[PDB]
């Protein structure tokens, strides 16, 4: 709500080996763009890499 209104107002008015966390994106206010519904792939497809049993 407050971040909602603030976004509306804004729109209309050394060797660093590790990346700085300030460069992160996806720090969003809309709950639809944070809690994205996860694809289930009919319960038979799985994401690569992660352990299958998990």
């Amino acid at each position: 709500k407050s971040k909602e209104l603030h976004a509306i107002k804004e729109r209309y008015l050394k060797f660093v080996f590790e990346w700085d966390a300030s460069e992160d994106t996806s720090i969003d206010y809309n709950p639809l763009y944070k809690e994205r519904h996860q694809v289930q792939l009919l319960g038979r497809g799985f994401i690569a890499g992660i352990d299958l049993k998990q």
């Binding site: 460069e23 994106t25 996806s26 969003d28 792939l41 799985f46 994401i47 690569a48 890499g49 299958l52």
Partner: protein
């Protein structure tokens, strides 16, 4: 691995005749992996078999479906298991090109 004042070991003296340790190899099942059971772990599989590979230059391969299925099952751990490109909606090359041109960042995308 080695000290800073030792010349490299001679290959003919300490490595030439030493039987190396076993390498990482998965135990392929005799039945469900029959098409690939014989040549899976080779330097250049099927190089000398004119049925499946172009020739010694190793520049083209022709495979049978029972072998492609086995190779596809074995590599599933590295595979996304998606059937569509709708998953990449507004998250693909064109979207990132547009965001760069418009000087905007898609959440979770490049900045």
């Amino acid at each position: 691995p080695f000290d800073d004042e030792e010349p490299p070991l001679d290959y003919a003296d300490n490595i030439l005749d030493v039987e190396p340790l076993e390498a990482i190899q998965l135990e392929l099942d005799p039945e469900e992996d029959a098409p690939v059971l014989d040549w899976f772990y080779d330097h250049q599989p099927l190089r000398d078999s004119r049925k499946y590979v172009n020739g010694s230059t190793y520049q083209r391969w022709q495979f049978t479906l029972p072998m492609m299925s086995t190779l596809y099952r074995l590599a599933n751990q590295l595979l996304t298991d998606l059937v569509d490109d709708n998953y990449f909606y507004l998250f693909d090359l064109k979207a990132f090109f547009t965001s760069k041109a418009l000087n905007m960042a898609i959440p979770g995308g490049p900045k």
